[PDB]
Design a protein around this motif. Structure first.
Motif, PDB file in Angstrom:
ATOM      1  N   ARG A   1       6.973   2.910   3.729  1.00 31.68           N
ATOM      2  CA  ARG A   1       6.756   1.865   4.723  1.00 31.68           C
ATOM      3  C   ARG A   1       8.057   1.464   5.412  1.00 31.68           C
ATOM      4  O   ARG A   1       9.144   1.685   4.883  1.00 31.68           O
ATOM      5  CB  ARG A   1       6.120   0.643   4.072  1.00 31.68           C
TER       6      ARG A   1
ATOM      7  N   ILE B   1       3.138   8.380  15.706  1.00 28.31           N
ATOM      8  CA  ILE B   1       3.862   8.883  14.544  1.00 28.31           C
ATOM      9  C   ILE B   1       2.962   8.829  13.321  1.00 28.31           C
ATOM     10  O   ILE B   1       2.449   7.768  12.966  1.00 28.31           O
ATOM     11  CB  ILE B   1       5.142   8.066  14.274  1.00 28.31           C
TER      12      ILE B   1
ATOM     13  N   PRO C   1       0.808  -1.201   0.000  1.00 27.58           N
ATOM     14  CA  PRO C   1       0.000   0.000   0.000  1.00 27.58           C
ATOM     15  C   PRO C   1       0.851   1.264   0.000  1.00 27.58           C
ATOM     16  O   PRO C   1       1.894   1.326   0.654  1.00 27.58           O
ATOM     17  CB  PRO C   1      -0.800  -0.151   1.295  1.00 27.58           C
ATOM     18  N   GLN C   2       0.353   2.294  -0.672  1.00 28.09           N
ATOM     19  CA  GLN C   2       0.994   3.599  -0.670  1.00 28.09           C
ATOM     20  C   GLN C   2       0.398   4.482   0.413  1.00 28.09           C
ATOM     21  O   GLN C   2      -0.723   4.974   0.281  1.00 28.09           O
ATOM     22  CB  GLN C   2       0.840   4.264  -2.040  1.00 28.09           C
ATOM     23  N   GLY C   3       1.143   4.654   1.496  1.00 27.77           N
ATOM     24  CA  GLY C   3       0.659   5.378   2.664  1.00 27.77           C
ATOM     25  C   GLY C   3       1.659   5.270   3.804  1.00 27.77           C
ATOM     26  O   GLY C   3       2.763   4.760   3.624  1.00 27.77           O
ATOM     27  N   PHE C   4       1.282   5.764   4.975  1.00 30.60           N
ATOM     28  CA  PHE C   4       2.210   5.794   6.095  1.00 30.60           C
ATOM     29  C   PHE C   4       1.624   5.200   7.369  1.00 30.60           C
ATOM     30  O   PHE C   4       0.488   5.496   7.741  1.00 30.60           O
ATOM     31  CB  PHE C   4       2.650   7.229   6.372  1.00 30.60           C
ATOM     32  N   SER C   5       2.434   4.405   8.059  1.00 35.01           N
ATOM     33  CA  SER C   5       2.113   3.909   9.390  1.00 35.01           C
ATOM     34  C   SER C   5       3.393   3.522  10.116  1.00 35.01           C
ATOM     35  O   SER C   5       4.430   3.307   9.486  1.00 35.01           O
ATOM     36  CB  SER C   5       1.178   2.720   9.309  1.00 35.01           C
ATOM     37  N   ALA C   6       3.332   3.428  11.438  1.00 35.08           N
ATOM     38  CA  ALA C   6       4.514   3.067  12.214  1.00 35.08           C
ATOM     39  C   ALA C   6       4.349   1.716  12.889  1.00 35.08           C
ATOM     40  O   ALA C   6       3.261   1.368  13.355  1.00 35.08           O
ATOM     41  CB  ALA C   6       4.813   4.140  13.251  1.00 35.08           C
TER      42      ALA C   6
ATOM     43  N   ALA D   1       6.731  11.276   8.316  1.00 32.25           N
ATOM     44  CA  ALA D   1       8.185  11.226   8.415  1.00 32.25           C
ATOM     45  C   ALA D   1       8.866  11.745   7.153  1.00 32.25           C
ATOM     46  O   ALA D   1       8.362  11.566   6.044  1.00 32.25           O
ATOM     47  CB  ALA D   1       8.639   9.803   8.690  1.00 32.25           C
TER      48      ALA D   1
ATOM     49  N   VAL E   1       8.697   2.248   8.783  1.00 37.53           N
ATOM     50  CA  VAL E   1       8.978   3.156   9.892  1.00 37.53           C
ATOM     51  C   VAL E   1       8.490   2.574  11.212  1.00 37.53           C
ATOM     52  O   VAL E   1       7.440   1.939  11.270  1.00 37.53           O
ATOM     53  CB  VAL E   1       8.333   4.533   9.641  1.00 37.53           C
TER      54      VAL E   1
END
Ligand SMILES: *[C@@H]1O[C@H](CO)[C@@H](O)[C@H](O)[C@H]1NC(C)=O
Ligand SMILES: *[C@@H]1O[C@H](CO)[C@@H](O)[C@H](O)[C@H]1NC(C)=O
Ligand SMILES: *[C@@H]1O[C@H](CO)[C@@H](O)[C@H](O)[C@H]1NC(C)=O
Ligand SMILES: *[C@@H]1O[C@H](CO)[C@@H](O)[C@H](O)[C@H]1NC(C)=O
Ligand SMILES: *[C@@H]1O[C@H](CO)[C@@H](O)[C@H](O)[C@H]1NC(C)=O
Ligand SMILES: *[C@@H]1O[C@H](CO)[C@@H](O)[C@H](O)[C@H]1NC(C)=O
Ligand SMILES: *[C@@H]1O[C@H](CO)[C@@H](O)[C@H](O)[C@H]1NC(C)=O
Ligand SMILES: *[C@@H]1O[C@H](CO)[C@@H](O)[C@H](O)[C@H]1NC(C)=O
Ligand SMILES: *[C@@H]1O[C@H](CO)[C@@H](O)[C@H](O)[C@H]1NC(C)=O
Ligand SMILES: *[C@@H]1O[C@H](CO)[C@@H](O)[C@H](O)[C@H]1NC(C)=O
Lengths: 445, 121, 126, 106, 107, 74, 49, 39
Positions: free
Chosen positions: F19, A82, A21-26, A85, F21
């Motif tokens: 991805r 978070i 997936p294209q996105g952000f998570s920690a 970044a 992080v």
């Protein structure tokens, strides 16, 4: 990390069929185990079953990436999670964002970093000396002198491998002042002086700078600015005799204290009331206590003058590289820079030149005796020219005070080398100033 | 399947320079470190240099240290060797390889290229 | 390792002279001097002298004063000894050795002995 | 010059036996200026001990020695077939001299 | 730098003969030794890693053993195709080094 | 216990985007921008895509740490 | 972890692995109690000119 | 009590909290056992 095997993890639903997936998570910490082992290889374990085709399984796939040392700017939201970044090494824009500590950048020009040219080759130059220094000739002597009449020898025109003495177990002490003994092999000196004598164990404590006592005051003294090494060892099996080896003596009386490296062998007081012989013998015997046994001492003093060195450690001379950024070492004179033929009219007695910054800017090569100029390798500031991040993510980069030929839509200006900007022959009002009449704008490119 | 192809060899004079390269394909080049090894005619193998998968650290033999530089490009899957201040003794066939190494390279496989001849005269 | 190589055997008449070389390898020539002795058939060791490879300084046994001379060649890392005014009693095997009993630079006595001996050169006088 | 005298002239010993060889100087000699040598028939001599406390390179640990004043000793803890040879004492405290030699034979 | 040596420098043998090669390290390299085989005009091929670990595809007639400083390579039944020069490599410490090699010829 | 079990398949790559992080430490922070230095998966890097059953699962190098991800219901 | 201040119940949503929080001044402003495992806020006692 | 020993020889120095119990050098000229007993 240092034997600790750390695991982080995250588990979410995905709407994609066969991709990431294209996105952000920690990811959150899962476990930290004190395992204490080395890992260089790994393998994935799957569950299999026995079918008509043999050992098999349902569809299974996975992705593998590798980690690298990087700097990130992490954004924590109100709930401490978070949410965003920046990878500060990804591109010039990200570097700008990290520099400004923001995820949003306004229109303008910002300095983010500096560049420097690295050395491409290393060279080493030393005098063409073939003889080895006679250290064994001094340390392995059959007899040492008395302390009141200490001996001195000069070592010159030779190569000194100091590891032979430093790593020797024969010495009880090896105390150096002003210099680290492990670095002696990388240094050159004009001369080395070796002083030697026999004293008591307890008297070895007086063989140093800033000391007082019967030996320090009347027999042997070192200066406060002494540079050198004091080496001593037990000689009870050699310099002791039954009945007392009174052949060894020291000065007991004097009217005044000695100066550094001074020697006085006068025998003037007949004896009587308040009249005594200046010298006193040692009761050196094999049955004496450890502090009362004889010890042999050798002191190595280093001399530095504006002259070709004659005592150098082990050498590995190389050829001489010119017109390139190199590392160099001229008789211990280390540094980094570009070396070229000099136009400086040196006189025969001059070995190097100096600037007002107290730096060397020219040297005489120890083998060819030619004069070389020394300059620093190219460097300068780097600025990023950007529209606001609310307009575009396209940027141009300016390398300050450098030719474009040294950098590796390339335009040379008086401010430096501008890359990424399209030069035009039109003229407009100044938007983002560069310098020397030159400005840049977003016109898109 | 797995290929390593050395090129850039030729004949040069002493004091000169030469740049070698090795193209990689058929495997995840950017995941592995790489070695250079050279062999003169009729002689045994001489290890030259090693570079990590990320192009971070670099290691050299004393025989080439200070003269040769090892580098790589993980975008073009190509390994490089930049040689300066060449000597007659540098005459050899230069190989790129992925050497099986349980301590350093981390590779579980061992691959060698065809080798390219460099002559200094 | 360290080795010394001497010349082959020779036969001389009385009143003549003989020159014996001592080629050195395996060590820095100027670090250690070269000593010389001889042995008559069935007899013990008779010291002849010693030369410093560093500064060319020489020392001799009194018995050979005016009879034995020495020289060194640093470029060929070789020592030499010559015995003059030969007599029938000079029939002996002559040896060279690497010296660690005297310093080559200062001339002081050291803790050591004669090592890395040559094969020996037989000289007969008749 | 200082003259060195060795004793006994010859030892007669079987293989595996221990041997002791003595040397006496006409004058007092420092231990730091004394050495011992060995020589086989038809061969050049070799240094065994120098300084009376240190053996030469390649010398077996069965070789030792000590001494003071005028009297010094060379010892072999156990004789091998290769130890049945001629030994010499040497000093360089004054000039440089060698002793008359001593032999060990079966 | 850890130095490697090999013995013999060369040997000859017939078909069916047993052939052994000895390698020695100047330093303790545990079992971190590779055995390579080379023929003229070709790049080296790895037969054994970590002293005694046989590589996949290598005929059962090949074996390796040893540890510390003393290592060995064996061919239980020499074939006409086994005529080659074998090299030892140590990879305990960088820089890595190769031995002089041992040649097996045909008797 | 062990079963004596064929051909490695061609390599394939995908885009890591942003991805990989993770929380660098266990200290609580909020409403703040924090700069950190650690081992991370570089943004927009090329990630290797494996299929165990399109059959094998090859031994890989660990290097300086590994990012692993697997999409499945089985 | 010694200090002086007023302790109250926190509204900070700590995750299970987090034992304390920090400010930009490099000071602790919240801790997890070692026995009850609840989160407490830490503030300085009143002061002024 | 020669049951107690220490390491006398190694090719390189140890890192902090490192331990090495290898017994690799046969003995001979320039070849020595790495461990030395205490008297
Ligand atoms: C683990 O790796 C380190 C190098 O980082 C090495 O010095 C150490 O000896 C290795 N441990 C083992 C058991 O090989
Ligand atoms: C799997 O199938 C093979 C062939 O039928 C058989 O030999 C083997 O024992 C089976 N193993 C199991 C666990 O069923
Ligand atoms: C923090 O979490 C609360 C729910 O507990 C949510 O309503 C709020 O919007 C979140 N704040 C942010 C910035 O996500
Ligand atoms: C090095 O050798 C050259 C001759 O090749 C000589 O002129 C020069 O003086 C030597 N350097 C030194 C320090 O003696
Ligand atoms: C002194 O002599 C010993 C041999 O007895 C030698 O090992 C040592 O290196 C010598 N010392 C020096 C400084 O040469
Ligand atoms: C940013 O762009 C939006 C349109 O996408 C505009 O409405 C807004 O005013 C801009 N912000 C600034 C500071 O110009
Ligand atoms: C560097 O730039 C200057 C103008 O600033 C120019 O005169 C000079 O020729 C340039 N040098 C090179 C190598 O192009
Ligand atoms: C600007 O004019 C110069 C001639 O002075 C020409 O060489 C250059 O290509 C022109 N550039 C553009 C964008 O027109
Ligand atoms: C597995 O097969 C290999 C041949 O490919 C054979 O050498 C090995 O001994 C077999 N292992 C077992 C347990 O049968
Ligand atoms: C990913 O790999 C492709 C080649 O398949 C290369 O062109 C591209 O630049 C790489 N991207 C990154 C971020 O490495």
């Amino acid at each position: 990390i240092d034997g600790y095997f750390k695991i982080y993890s995250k588990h979410t639903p995905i709407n994609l069929v066969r991709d990431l997936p294209q996105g952000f998570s920690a990811l959150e910490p899962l476990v930290d185990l004190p395992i204490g082992i080395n890992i260089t290889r790994f393998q994935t374990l799957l569950a299999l079953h026995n079918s008509s085709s043999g050992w098999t399984a349902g569809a299974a796939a996975y992705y593998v990436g590798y980690l690298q040392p990087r700097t990130f700017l992490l954004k924590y939201n109100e709930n401490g999670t978070i949410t965003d970044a920046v990878d500060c090494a990804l591109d010039p824009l990200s570097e700008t964002k990290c520099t400004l500590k923001s995820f949003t950048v306004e229109k303008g020009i910002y300095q983010t970093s500096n560049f420097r040219v690295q050395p491409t080759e290393s060279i080493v130059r030393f005098p063409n000396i073939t003889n080895l220094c006679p250290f064994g000739e001094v340390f392995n002597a059959t007899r040492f002198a008395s302390v009141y009449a200490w001996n001195r020898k000069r070592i010159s025109n030779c190569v000194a491998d100091y590891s032979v003495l430093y790593n020797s177990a024969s010495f009880s002490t090896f105390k150096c002042y002003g210099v680290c003994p492990t670095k002696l092999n990388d240094l050159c000196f004009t001369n080395v002086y070796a002083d030697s004598f026999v004293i008591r164990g307890d008297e070895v404590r007086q063989i140093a700078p800033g000391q007082t006592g019967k030996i320090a005051d009347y027999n042997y003294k070192l200066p406060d600015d002494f540079t050198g090494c004091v080496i001593a060892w037990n000689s009870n099996n050699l310099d002791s005799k039954v009945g007392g080896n009174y052949n060894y003596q020291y000065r007991l009386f004097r009217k005044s204290n000695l100066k550094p490296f001074e020697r006085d062998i006068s025998t003037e007081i007949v004896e009587g009331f308040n009249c005594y012989s200046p010298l006193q013998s040692y009761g050196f015997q094999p049955t004496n206590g450890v502090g009362y046994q004889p010890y042999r001492v050798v002191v190595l003093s280093f001399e530095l003058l504006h002259a070709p060195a004659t005592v150098c450690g082990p050498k590995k001379s190389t050829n001489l590289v010119k017109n390139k950024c190199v590392n160099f070492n001229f008789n211990g004179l280390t540094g980094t820079g570009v070396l070229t033929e000099s136009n400086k009219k040196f006189l025969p007695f001059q070995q190097f030149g100096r600037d007002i910054a107290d730096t060397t800017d020219a040297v005489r090569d120890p083998q060819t005796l030619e004069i070389l100029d020394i300059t620093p390798c190219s460097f300068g500031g780097v600025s990023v020219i950007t529209p606001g991040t609310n307009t575009s993510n396209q940027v141009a980069v300016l390398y300050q005070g450098v030719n474009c030929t040294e950098v590796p839509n390339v335009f040379q200006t008086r401010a430096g080398c501008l890359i990424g900007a399209e030069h035009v022959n039109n003229s407009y009002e100044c938007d983002i100033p560069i310098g020397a009449g030159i400005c840049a704008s977003y016109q898109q490119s | 399947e797995v290929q390593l192809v050395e090129s850039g060899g030729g004949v040069v004079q002493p004091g000169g320079s030469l740049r070698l390269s090795c193209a990689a394909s058929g495997f995840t080049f950017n995941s592995y470190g790489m070695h250079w090894v050279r062999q003169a005619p009729g002689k045994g193998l001489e290890w030259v240099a090693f570079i990590r998968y990320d192009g971070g650290n670099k290691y050299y033999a004393d025989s080439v240290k200070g003269r040769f530089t090892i580098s790589r490009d993980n975008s073009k899957n190509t390994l490089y060797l930049q040689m300066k201040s060449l000597r007659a003794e540098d005459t050899a066939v230069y190989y790129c390889a992925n050497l099986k190494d349980s301590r350093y390279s981390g590779s579980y496989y061992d691959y060698w290229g065809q080798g390219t001849l460099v002559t200094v005269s | 390792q360290v080795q010394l190589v001497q010349s082959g055997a020779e036969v001389k008449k009385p009143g003549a002279s003989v020159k014996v070389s001592c080629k050195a390898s395996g060590y820095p020539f100027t670090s250690y001097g070269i000593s010389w002795v001889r042995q008559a058939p069935g007899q013990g060791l008779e010291w002849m002298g010693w030369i410093s490879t560093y500064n060319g300084n020489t020392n001799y046994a009194q018995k050979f004063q005016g009879r034995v001379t020495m020289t060194t060649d640093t470029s060929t890392t070789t020592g030499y000894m010559e015995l003059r005014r030969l007599r029938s009693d000079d029939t002996a095997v002559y040896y060279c050795a690497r010296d660690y009993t005297r310093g080559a630079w200062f001339g002081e006595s050291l803790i050591g002995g004669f090592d890395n001996w040559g094969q020996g050169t037989l000289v007969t006088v008749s | 010059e200082i003259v060195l005298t060795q004793s006994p002239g010859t030892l007669s010993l079987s293989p595996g036996e221990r041997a002791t060889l003595s040397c006496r100087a006409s004058q007092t000699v420092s231990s730091t200026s004394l050495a011992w040598y060995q020589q086989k028939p038809g061969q050049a001599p070799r240094l065994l001990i120098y300084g009376a406390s240190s053996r030469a390179t390649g010398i077996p640990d069965r070789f030792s020695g000590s001494g003071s004043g005028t009297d010094f000793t060379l010892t072999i803890s156990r004789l091998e077939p290769e130890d049945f040879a001629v030994y010499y004492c040497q000093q360089h405290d004054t000039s440089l001299t060698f002793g008359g030699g001593t032999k060990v034979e079966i | 730098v850890i130095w490697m040596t090999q013995s013999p420098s060369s040997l000859s043998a017939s078909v069916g003969d047993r052939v052994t090669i000895t390698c020695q390290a100047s330093q303790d390299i545990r079992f971190y030794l590779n055995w390579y085989q080379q023929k003229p005009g070709k790049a080296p091929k790895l037969l054994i890693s970590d002293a005694s670990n046989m590589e996949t595809g290598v005929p059962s007639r090949f074996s390796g053993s040893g540890s510390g400083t003393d290592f060995t390579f064996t061919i239980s039944s020499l074939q006409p195709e086994d005529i080659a020069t074998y090299y030892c490599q140590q990879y305990d410490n960088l820089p890595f080094t190769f031995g002089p090699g041992t040649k097996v010829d045909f008797k | 216990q062990c079963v004596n079990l064929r051909t490695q398949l061609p390599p394939a790559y995908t885009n890591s985007f942003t991805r990989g992080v993770y929380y660098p430490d266990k200290v609580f922070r909020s409403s703040v921008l924090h700069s950190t230095q650690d081992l991370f998966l570089p943004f927009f890097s090329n990630v290797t895509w494996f299929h165990a059953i399109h059959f094998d699962n090859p031994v890989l190098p660990f290097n300086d740490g590994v990012y692993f991800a697997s999409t499945e219901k089985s």
